[PDB]
């Protein structure tokens, strides 16, 4: 049926330049706009092409930012977007736009990262307190997203909950709780473990009481 | 320029009737403004509702309906289902852009409202060890999913130094969020007690610990 496919997901240095691409199936590529969506932390319309007849139209912020452009034989759109800077950090969509609209459907966003920071493992630390008890793995410092959490193994699924990374001095932060019986802890051991593919890390870290 | 503004937070029950407004700074809302309408659900999962005013986009079911009324475009769900509980954008077309609304968070009550667990845990002693200390707030299980936090250090207001995720929906369907304050080791042995305060619905919870 209708489709919008996006390419994946990007990082990319300060001052350079990336091209994302956007291809098109279930219709006919000519008669409609490929219009450029921006999602910060707020949305922000880039611009849109008519890939019938090239024509664009830009956001005046972002003419000095972005160059679209389409091939109608390929049936993809594509944006350059150059001199990267922090603040193009987002996550970008393209949607299908035609008169009076700019999106009935709409891919499923790649995201960009900049940063000049380099690959670096995260720092693991047990989050111990001292009817049930919660305990917690703080995954500290680590570059490039992602890493996954797993508890006991995998065992422990139940009541855990991995919250998103967050932004600290240009590296990301984690963490990762369980809640348990407090009749079952310290007597049945507790372990996070965390993996970060992309510094080949695998760490293990038991829960102790203080 | 144009700012467009939309109430920043609406909740219903299933089975009733609520209206979003979008408003411009540059007047009234007019048809050449082709009020547009979509929908986020969790994981940037994006849906055209309406196109030009009032037009529903494809397989958008019947009980979304956009209008303009007055000087404002507006979307009205007739009938607001569970699945309905999403982010809510508007964009009018103006001076040749697309101008995006700030969004709406509609919850519509699909279960009774949950009070927020919230834990406070101590830096460890092996971070400790490396001269960084950082405070660790998990706040699980509430419902709306809309959540203020305050961090406290003696009394003071802590202004700098933290960060709170956005609120994320958890598999019941209840939402968590994860709130951080990061002092060097030398800050965090200058104070006594450190808070962290959650309000949601009007009510706070506060934890505390003392070094
Ligand atoms: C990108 C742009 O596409 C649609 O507007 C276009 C119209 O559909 C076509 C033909 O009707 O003409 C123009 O290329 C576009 O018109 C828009 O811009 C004109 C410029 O004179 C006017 O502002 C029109 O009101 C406006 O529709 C779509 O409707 C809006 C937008 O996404």
């Known amino acids: 049926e209708v489709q919008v496919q996006q390419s994946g997901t990007v990082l990319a240095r300060p001052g350079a330049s990336v091209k994302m691409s956007c291809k098109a199936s279930?219709?006919?590529?000519?008669?409609?706009?490929m219009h450029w969506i921006k999602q910060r932390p707020g949305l922000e319309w880039i611009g849109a092409?008519?890939?019938?007849?090239?024509?664009?139209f830009y956001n005046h912020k972002f003419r000095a930012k972005t160059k679209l452009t389409a091939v109608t034989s390929t049936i993809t759109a594509y944006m350059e977007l150059s001199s990267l800077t922090n603040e193009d950090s987002a996550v970008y969509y393209c949607?299908?736009?035609?008169?009076?609209?700019?999106?009935?459907?709409w891919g499923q966003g790649a995201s960009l990262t900049v940063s000049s920071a380099k690959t670096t493992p995260p720092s693991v630390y047990p989050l111990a307190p001292g009817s049930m008890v919660t305990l917690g793995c703080l995954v500290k410092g680590y570059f490039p997203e992602p890493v996954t959490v797993t508890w006991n193994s995998g065992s422990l699924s139940s009541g855990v909950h991995t919250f998103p990374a967050v932004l600290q001095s240009d590296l990301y932060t984690l963490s990762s709780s369980v809640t348990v019986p407090s009749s079952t802890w310290p007597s049945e051991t507790v372990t996070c473990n965390v993996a970060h593919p992309a510094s080949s890390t695998k760490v293990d870290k038991k829960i102790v009481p203080r | 320029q144009a700012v467009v503004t939309q109430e920043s937070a609406l909740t219903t029950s299933p089975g009733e009737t609520v209206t979003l407004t979008c408003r411009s700074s540059?007047?009234?809302?007019?048809?050449?403004?082709?009020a547009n309408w979509v929908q986020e659900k969790p994981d940037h999962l994006f849906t055209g509702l309406i196109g030009?005013?009032?037009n529903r986009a494809p397989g958008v079911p019947a009980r979304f309906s956009g209008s303009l009324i007055g000087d404002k475009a507006a979307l009205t769900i007739t009938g607001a289902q569970p699945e309905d509980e999403a982010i809510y954008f508007c964009?009018?077309?103006?001076?040749?852009?697309?101008?995006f609304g700030g969004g709406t968070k509609l919850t519509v009550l699909g279960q009774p409202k949950s009070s927020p667990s919230v834990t406070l845990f101590p830096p460890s002693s092996e971070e400790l060890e490396t001269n960084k200390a950082t405070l660790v707030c998990t706040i699980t299980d509430f419902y709306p999913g809309v959540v203020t936090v305050d961090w406290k250090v003696d009394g003071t207001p802590v202004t700098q130094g933290m960060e709170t995720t956005q609120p994320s929906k958890q598999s019941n369907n209840k939402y968590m969020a994860s709130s951080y304050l990061t002092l060097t080791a030398r800050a965090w042995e200058r104070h006594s007690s450190y808070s962290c305060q959650v309000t949601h619905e009007g009510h706070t919870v506060e934890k505390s610990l003392s070094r």
């Open positions: 949607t299908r736009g035609g008169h009076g609209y700019y999106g009935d459907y």
């Open positions: 092409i008519y890939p019938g007849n090239s024509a664009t």
């Open positions: 279930g219709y006919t590529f000519t008669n409609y706009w």
């Open positions: 030009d005013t009032n």
């Open positions: 540059t007047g009234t809302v007019t048809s050449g403004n082709h």
């Open positions: 964009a009018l077309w103006c001076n040749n852009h697309w101008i």
